[PDB]
Amino acid sequence: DKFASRHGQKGVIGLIVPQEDMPWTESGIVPDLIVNPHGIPSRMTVGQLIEAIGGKVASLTGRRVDGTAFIGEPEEKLRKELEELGFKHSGREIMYDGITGRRLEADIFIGVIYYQRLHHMVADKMHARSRGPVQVLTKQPTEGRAREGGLRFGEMERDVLIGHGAAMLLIERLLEESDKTEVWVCESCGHLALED
Amino acid sequence: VCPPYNADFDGDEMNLHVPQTEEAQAEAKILMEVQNHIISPRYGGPLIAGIQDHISGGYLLTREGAYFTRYEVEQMLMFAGMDVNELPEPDKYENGEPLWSGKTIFSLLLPDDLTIWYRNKLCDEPERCEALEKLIEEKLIPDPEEVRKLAYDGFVYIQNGKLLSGAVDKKAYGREDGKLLDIIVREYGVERARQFLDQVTKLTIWVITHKGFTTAIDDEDLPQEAIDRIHEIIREAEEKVQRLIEAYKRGELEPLPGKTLEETLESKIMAVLAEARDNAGKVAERYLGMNNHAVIMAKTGARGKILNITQMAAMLGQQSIRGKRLYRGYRGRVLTHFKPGDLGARARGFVTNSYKSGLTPQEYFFHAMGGREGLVDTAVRTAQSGYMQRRLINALQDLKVDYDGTVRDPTGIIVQFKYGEDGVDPMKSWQGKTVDVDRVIVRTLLKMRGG
Amino acid sequence: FRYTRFEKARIIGARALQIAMGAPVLIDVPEGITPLQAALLEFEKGVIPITVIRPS
Amino acid sequence: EFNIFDHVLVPEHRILSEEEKEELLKKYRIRISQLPQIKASDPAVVALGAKPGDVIEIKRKSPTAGYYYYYRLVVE
Amino acid sequence: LGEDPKDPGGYFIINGSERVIVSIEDLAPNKTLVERDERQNKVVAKVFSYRHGYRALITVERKKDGILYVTIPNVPKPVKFVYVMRALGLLTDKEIVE
Amino acid sequence: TEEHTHLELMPAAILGIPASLVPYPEHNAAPRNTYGAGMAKQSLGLGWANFRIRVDTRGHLMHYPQVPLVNSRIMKAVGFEDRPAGQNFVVAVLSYHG
Amino acid sequence: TLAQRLKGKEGRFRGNLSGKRVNFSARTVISPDPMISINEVGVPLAVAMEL
Amino acid sequence: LHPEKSRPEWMVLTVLPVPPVTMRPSITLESGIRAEDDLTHKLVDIIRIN
Amino acid sequence: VAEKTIKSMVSKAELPDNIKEELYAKLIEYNEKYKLKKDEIQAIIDETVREYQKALIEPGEAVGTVAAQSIGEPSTQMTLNTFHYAGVAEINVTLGLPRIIEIVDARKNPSTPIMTVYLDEEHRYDRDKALEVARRIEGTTLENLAREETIDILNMEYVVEIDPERLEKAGLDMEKVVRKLTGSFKSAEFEAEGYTLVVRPKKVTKLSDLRKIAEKVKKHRLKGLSGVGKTIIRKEGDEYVIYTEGSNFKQVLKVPGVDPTRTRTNNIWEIAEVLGIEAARNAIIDEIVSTMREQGLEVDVRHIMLVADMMTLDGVIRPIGRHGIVGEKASVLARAAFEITTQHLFAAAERGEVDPLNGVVENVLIGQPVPVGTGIVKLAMSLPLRPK
Amino acid sequence: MIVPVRCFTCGKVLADKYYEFKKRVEAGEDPGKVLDDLGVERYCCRRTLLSHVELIDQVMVYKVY
Amino acid sequence: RVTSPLSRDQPHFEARDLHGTHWGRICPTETPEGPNCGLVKNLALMSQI
DNA sequence: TCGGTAATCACGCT
DNA sequence: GATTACCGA
Ligand SMILES: [Mg+2]
Ligand SMILES: [Zn+2]
Ligand SMILES: [Zn+2]
């Protein structure tokens, strides 16, 4: 189920780890979304990291921090309001791992970021088709999941099998798992015969 | 296996399709399994290799000072597949407590008679490599104890399946050339190198899990006197621009022969602006150390450069559009906040504040102009390359290789004798060349002489 | 006389199809095996009857 | 002063003999018409003694083999 | 009445599916433009003009001999300026000058 | 000074209505904001009060929506802090087991 | 008419003859796991019981 | 040209062949209304001008 | 140990090994001097023959499809680059994906021709003497030594004007003003204020149409050889290079000072007409290599030498689509799924034409096994078949 | 959409301490001392009182039988 | 929305840009990606017609 | 030279 | 609507 921020950090749930195996902090905090650290100093989204302090400041103070463009709350005045409410000036905190239990010799960053769920949910994508209803004109499968039809193999997908050398698979995929018809054909005229 | 598919995990779609008949199924297993495709036919180098955590985990394992205790060595050898008996031995530095080193936990995965030596991306002092190189070349097999503890952290040297000196980064894995997965598929089959890459991957993500690799907001932060070093660069580079406008305006043109006076002016101006941003990029890069977890990701190489970490506590450079500086707008003035007839730096598309110190509203609207030039060239260029591929496949899909080494068309017209300037497959050649005498000599001699 | 990669994947393909249509198996038994997997064990011991033709 | 030869782009040609046509024909089991046909224009062939219906050998070089031969024909 | 007050409005309910006209951006009718140079020929000056329906390009081109073409929609056959301008309403060459 | 001819209103309203959802939009890169203003038009969220008495082809509803923390003062004066879309997690930044 | 049924970028050389719709397939999303080998793949048990 | 496969006077259509029914299907619209095929619709109008 | 001992150990082994290999292996073996003696010399040569024998191509390969895919993959990752290159001499040569289409599709015209000019042994190191060669190549008319044309009052009708400073830094030689009389029509000689008065004592043909004389002799002046564009000089490798513009080959090679044997070109059809087909082989190969390396990403040159040695297959180079190799000889169904034109093409080969087999696109279209790959092997098997 | 009776990270009841909280912020009192006066210690409990919509009133009146 | 009647597919490198007259009338960022990428654009939040 | 006409312009999915 | 190039006086 695809989630995203409003800064552009889109992604998918990796797994769904229990509460017991969570790297937790020297307070009652147990994180929710353990975001990959390899995506923040690669996409230049510093507004993610300013908002993460702005969630921690505006939850402890009481008043929702204004954050509009060009006239909003400045950068340096936040990091003093966090520094006199009981925390280190840059978010970093002492964290204990939950599997074994010893302080990770670093200071793991942590905040409050507003995410939002998107409607590219997984139960509207998955389909399987063994043998369904076909086309009237060609006797080939249909299009779309609402009319129970499979995938279509363009001219890209025919050529990526000839590059291997697969000639047995290329017959069985394209014609044997498709329409096969048996036809009576004359010899010296070349035209089709007519059963009766 | 996600540089062949060129995928990522932000909700993509992959389709499988089962083959059925017993001839088309035993053809799929022998000719199309993954381990046959570890190197690629475009450049020889490995393609299925390590990515983002597999590189930057491997730097934390081979740093000088990576001493694991007894519980953490024994726990990780169970998790990375391998099967060894009671030999984690011999507790190499008992100085504090009986605990191992980081090199020898990596030296259980390698086969028993490797010999490779090369220099990698982290080399910041070229003189202290020299000494190591000179000794090695004259005394082919010294003792691994005495002389080899004069080692460096940027010269990988393995002998007999024992990493004496080195530091693993993106020169041993990686989507482009890494010459430690490369030299394990041409010497020790294929089926060995599917369990080198299956045990490295699970060993390396272990140490990056239980050691912490956060990257907070203070990684971009510079102290006050380093910020004032930047502002003297931006001031005099703006002064050189204000002087060069006055040289053109009073007739001190100093022209180039090829270009016109407007095109000479734009040339000189842009060079000053360009250089100014690189000179300020060197100040920040020199200052903040290689000990936070934002430059470890940039030196080794896993989603980073050293440009966009000095584009976050410094300038953002100029903001151009296909080689010209921003000029479209009103009658002689881009925005209506500037007096017209002006060619200044601050007034014609040049931002001067970071992604930390806030962009003022002329700089932000100058920044959307440069950002939309990047998004148009994704959807325009994709449709021209897609049609250009259909031309070449459908004209060239006929050509085979016969048994006597001849490439022939369907009519029997010989296209190329003795395929591809006979005759070695580029999938298995080394860097364009052929049999690789150089490597052979060193490898064969070492095993024989070493014994 | 080593086989190529195209001949090795055709000899298995023809032998896995005979081994489904009758054609009594050599010493290949244990306990349950799909007809493709029977041809893989026979090729390792070098008791394949099927030979290639090399046009030259 | 120069010619088409003595150049870093043009490889050197030579006109075959009468006995080598059938000897080349049996080495590759081909037919005479199945060879890639230089035209009677295009100065590489015209400064040699070009007769239509003949095989002319080139000795071109590649940076991954050494020297490598490649046979062609002459059509009007 | 079965609504919410935050609804802004601006959409029809033609046939039972709420359909909205999206504003198409014109190119300034009854204006005139001075078109650029050297795409196939010399400078042209294109225009649009419509009243109660039909719109049409009526351009005054020129190529590299000084013809000063005028373009008509129907039966295209590009006509010289001094053919039409004499035949339309003015006869004296002094009046075409002034 | 005595040189100007007009005076701006607030200049924090150059940008559109779903690009005024991104807090601090002068710190990010430029293609990251364009993706951000292209996904406030796709999130789930309780948008109108009459989702019960309505027949539309497919609708969505999010059980516990939340007014965001740090945001613009513009999104108070369109109505977005009365029909919002999305929740407030508490993230951490560390590399987990792969 | 006939010339547009034979042709037209979705006619009856690329549209239906040399690229066809197939049977025994599936299509869903992807999500990592670094615990299986390099040449294996996960398959859901819903797709596994309909192929 | 070829004297057994391509005579030139056969290029002028004296007899126009009719394609079969199976190449011109009859699509049903809602439940009982049949959308006539595009080839079928023009062939009906050919016969009335003949 | 010496020369004879080594050389003849490779000679014996030779017959499976190669010609290039032989020279290579010796010259490195000899170099190593902490020397190895006899048994490991035989071990190295018997190991070099095993790696060469391991790395030959399998007969039956599908070369032509994996050539088109490995050249069409790297052009999709052709994102933006540093378009603000820091050079001066080479100017505006259309880097990127639009070059790759211009080299594949023939296109007689191509935009931005830049022909590299190299110099011989007498104009190599002399700074100002190399300049006059570039002067001799460039060539200038009278229209670019102006800014506009201002008419006279009654009868002089013409004047030369701003500016004169193109003759004191490049040296376009005021003696050439005297020279102007070369094969011209009237050629009066009068320089009062530095401009040559040319009187025209005739009638109705030229009356006041100054604009048509701008296409005649006023533009027909050819002050210098090789009537092509501008020349830039760069210092590289202690030779001066002259990176000109345009393409005028058989005139450019006949210039006193250009070294004729090394001048490379950014054109395709002219190097085929002048230097021959197999030189245009090496023009196509060396040009697609230079585009790939400048953009960072590498392709191996086995794939390039399959396209280039198939595009000169019929003595005149062909384009790649709808008028070239697909439009050339094949099965008539091979031309059906490419170049959707068929009432032009499919009804043309209705007249006197057979169609056997043996493509790759036909047997997939009709239901037969294709010839490449695993449909190339032929089996045979005897039949007592006792189980035992 | 009435207040969630748990938090989303820290398991702790909250719906008894929301309608007492908001009726003491519509007198002008600062929320920084009201939430401290109740039993709210961390800031994972506290981000879900301080940001909520109480939208049950509008939807309820619209009716469906 | 403010759409623009042109061709959706052929590149318009000078008609998909971002011009100085858009200041205060058209939004600089909101542009859907696909083949359009700069042919449908949105009005700013302080304007009058 | 010089004017004229067609014929061409990703993958999948709703 | 833009590139070409082949075709036509
Ligand atoms: Mg994706
Ligand atoms: Zn018959
Ligand atoms: Zn909580």
UniProtKB/Swiss-Prot annotation, chain C:
NCBIfam families according to UniProt: PRK01099.1-3 (NF002208)
GO cellular component: chromosome; cytoplasm; DNA-directed RNA polymerase complex
Enzyme nomenclature, EC number: 2.7.7.6
Keyword Transcription: yes
Record function comment: DNA-dependent RNA polymerase (RNAP) catalyzes the transcription of DNA into RNA using the four ribonucleoside triphosphates as substrates.
Keyword Nucleus: no
Reactions that this protein is recorded to catalyse: RNA(n) + a ribonucleoside 5'-triphosphate = RNA(n+1) + diphosphate
Keyword annotations of the record: Chromosome, Cytoplasm, DNA-directed RNA polymerase, Nucleotidyltransferase, Transcription, Transferase
InterPro entries linked to this entry: DNA-dir_RNA_polK_14-18kDa_CS, Pol_omega/Rpo6/RPB6, RPB6/omega-like_sf, Rpo6/Rpb6
Gene Ontology MF terms in the entry: DNA binding; DNA-directed RNA polymerase activity
Subunit structure: Part of the RNA polymerase complex.
Family matches, as HAMAP family: RNApol_arch_Rpo6
Family: Belongs to the archaeal Rpo6/eukaryotic RPB6 RNA polymerase subunit family.
Name of the protein in question: DNA-directed RNA polymerase subunit Rpo6
Any one GO biological process: DNA-templated transcription
Location of the protein in the cell: Cytoplasm; Chromosome
Family matches, as Pfam families: RNA_pol_Rpb6
From Swiss-Prot, chain D:
Chief location bin: cytoplasm
Assigned keywords, A-Z: Cytoplasm, DNA-directed RNA polymerase, Nucleotidyltransferase, Transcription, Transferase
Record has Transferase as a keyword: yes
Localization annotation: Cytoplasm
Coiled coil residues, start to end: none
EC number: 2.7.7.6
Catalytic activity annotation: RNA(n) + a ribonucleoside 5'-triphosphate = RNA(n+1) + diphosphate
GO molecular function, one term: DNA-directed RNA polymerase activity
GO terms under cellular component: cytoplasm; DNA-directed RNA polymerase complex
InterPro entries: Arch_Rpo5/euc_Rpb5, RNA_pol_subH/Rpb5_C, RNA_pol_subH/Rpb5_CS, RPB5-like_sf
Alphabetical list of Gene3D superfamilies matching this protein: RPB5-like RNA polymerase subunit
The organism's place on the tree of life at top rank: Archaea
PROSITE patterns (alphabetical): RNA_POL_H_23KD (PS01110)
GO biological process: DNA-templated transcription
Keyword Repeat: no
Top-tier EC class: transferase
Protein task: DNA-dependent RNA polymerase (RNAP) catalyzes the transcription of DNA into RNA using the four ribonucleoside triphosphates as substrates.
Recorded family membership: Belongs to the archaeal Rpo5/eukaryotic RPB5 RNA polymerase subunit family.
PANTHER family: DNA-DIRECTED RNA POLYMERASES I, II, AND III SUBUNIT RPABC1 (PTHR10535:SF0)
NCBIfam families: PRK09570.1
Subunit structure: Part of the RNA polymerase complex.
HAMAP family linked to this entry: RNApol_Rpo5_RPB5 (MF_00025)
Protein name, UniProt field: DNA-directed RNA polymerase subunit Rpo5
Curated annotation (Swiss-Prot), chain I:
Source domain of life: Archaea
UniProt main location, coarse: cytoplasm
EC number: 2.7.7.6
Reaction(s) the record says it catalyses: RNA(n) + a ribonucleoside 5'-triphosphate = RNA(n+1) + diphosphate
GO biological process: DNA-templated transcription
GO MF annotation, one: DNA binding
Keywords: Chromosome, Cytoplasm, DNA-binding, DNA-directed RNA polymerase, Nucleotidyltransferase, Transcription, Transferase
Location in or out of the cell: Cytoplasm; Chromosome
Family matches, as Gene3D superfamilies: 1.10.150.390
Cross-referenced InterPro entries: DNA-dir_RpoC_beta_prime, RNA_pol_Rpb1_5, RPO1C
Pfam family, one: RNA_pol_Rpb1_5
One GO term describing the cellular component: chromosome
Subunit structure comment from the entry: Part of the RNA polymerase complex.
Role, per record: DNA-dependent RNA polymerase (RNAP) catalyzes the transcription of DNA into RNA using the four ribonucleoside triphosphates as substrates. Forms part of the jaw domain.
Family named by the database record: Belongs to the RNA polymerase beta' chain family.
Protein name, per record: DNA-directed RNA polymerase subunit Rpo1C
Organism field: Thermococcus kodakarensis (strain ATCC BAA-918 / JCM 12380 / KOD1)
From Swiss-Prot, chain J:
One GO cellular component term noted in the UniProt record for this chain: chromosome
Localization (cell): Cytoplasm; Chromosome
Cofactor note: Binds 1 zinc ion.
Essential cofactor(s): Zn(2+)
PROSITE patterns recorded: RNA_POL_N_8KD
Statement: the UniProt record of this protein carries the keyword Transmembrane helix: no
Superkingdom in the source lineage: Archaea
Enzyme class: transferase
GO molecular function, one term: zinc ion binding
Entry keyword set: Chromosome, Cytoplasm, DNA-directed RNA polymerase, Metal-binding, Nucleotidyltransferase, Transcription, Transferase, Zinc
Documented EC number(s): 2.7.7.6
The keyword Cell wall biogenesis/degradation is assigned to this record: no
One BP annotation, GO: DNA-templated transcription
UniProt: Zn(2+) binding residues: 7, 10, 44-45
Reaction(s) this enzyme catalyzes, per UniProt: RNA(n) + a ribonucleoside 5'-triphosphate = RNA(n+1) + diphosphate
Binding partners and assembly: Part of the RNA polymerase complex.
Family per similarity comment: Belongs to the archaeal Rpo10/eukaryotic RPB10 RNA polymerase subunit family.
Function: DNA-dependent RNA polymerase (RNAP) catalyzes the transcription of DNA into RNA using the four ribonucleoside triphosphates as substrates.
NCBIfam families assigned: PRK04016.1
Protein name: DNA-directed RNA polymerase subunit Rpo10
Organism of provenance: Thermococcus kodakarensis (strain ATCC BAA-918 / JCM 12380 / KOD1) (Pyrococcus kodakaraensis (strain KOD1))
